[PDB]
């Protein structure tokens, strides 16, 4: 599922150190509970587009979603 895939990549980014623990946890909480269906589609598109570049993915996820994710 979309969530399983999202968790796998987010854990990878955290383990690689491209995102921190707090962002990883906030992001997954947000993605699974608060993200609209349209936002979920955007996350999936980001993940697909940046598949070859985890650092770029991380930076884009932070830039785009940090405000919505962190509270």
Residue numbers in the entry: 620 to 690
Sentences reproduced from the published study:
The Arabidopsis VEL proteins are accessory proteins that interact with PRC2 to nucleate and propagate silencing at the FLOWERING LOCUS C (FLC) locus, enabling early flowering in spring. Here, we report that VEL proteins contain a domain related to an atypical four-helix bundle that engages in spontaneous concentration-dependent head-to-tail polymerization to assemble dynamic biomolecular condensates. The VEL domain adopts a compact globular fold, consisting of four α-helices in a quasi-antiparallel “up-down-up-down” configuration, each of which contributes to the hydrophobic core, as illustrated by VEL1VEL. Mutations blocking polymerization of this VEL domain prevent Polycomb silencing at FLC.
We conclude that the VEL head and tail surfaces are defined largely by three key residues, an isoleucine (VIN3I575 or VEL1I664) and two basic residues (VIN3R554,R556 or VEL1R643,K645), that engage in close hydrophobic or electrostatic interactions, respectively, with partner residues from the apposing complementary surface. The equivalent double mutation of VEL1VEL (RK>AD) also essentially blocks polymerization. Importantly, the RK>AD mutant never forms floaters nor fibers.
